[PDB]
Task: structure prediction
Amino acid sequence: GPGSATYIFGKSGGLILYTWPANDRPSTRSDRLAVGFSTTVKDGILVRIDSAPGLGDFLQLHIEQGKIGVVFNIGTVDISIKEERTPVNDGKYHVVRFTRNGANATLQVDNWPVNEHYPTGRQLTIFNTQAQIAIGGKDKGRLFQGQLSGLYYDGLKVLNMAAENNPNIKINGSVRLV
Ligand SMILES: *[C@@H]1O[C@H](CO[C@@H]2O[C@H](CO)[C@@H](O)[C@H](O)[C@@H]2O)[C@@H](O[C@@H]2O[C@H](CO)[C@@H](O)[C@H](O)[C@H]2NC(C)=O)[C@H](O)[C@H]1NC(C)=O
Ligand SMILES: [Ca+2]
Result:
């Protein structure tokens, strides 16, 4: 709601970084990711979850040519799902919702027709030993500029945790709680 923690990222970019305590690093067969955003950027990474060093697994929510999508890897090759029909960089508030079940995924913006992707043949299922949630894209040189609100990832309200000064959150660069 109104109480959902909201952060503004400026033109110079910033990062909010959640690092799981070592023993708390999760492994999942399915994920759920959602965030409210407003932006005019043609390109930027909003959120990326990475596994521990040496493991290639990741899950990345990003905008490319004004269109929002998720690319992820759970141990085979990059799997992508995208809202290709309509751009989201119109400077209006949207909600993007993503689910993953093994190699399968869904993606919806607002109330638009749902995108679904079901890779064929033998697949892996586990997103192994997740180590960090990077928000804002600055670390990968694709900074997000705009507003992020009410980020939800697998039960974690990460922006709420940032706003509450969670000891496993680091914030730097051009980012501000509103
Ligand atoms: C990932 O998704 C596959 C395929 O999903 C099935 O096919 C269509 C996709 O076009 C989808 O709309 C249906 O809902 C259906 O689930 C899953 O594989 C299927 O699993 C179901 C339920 O266990 C079986 O009835 C089907 O035989 C089976 N089909 C195939 C082609 O294998 C798969 O389980 C799923 N992966 C995970 C981890 O959930
Ligand atoms: Ca894996």
About this structure: The helical segments are 158-163. The chain has one domain: 1-178. Residues 57, 74-75, 124, 126, 128 surround calcium ion (ligand 2) (CB under 6 Å). The first strand starts at residue 6 and ends at 19.
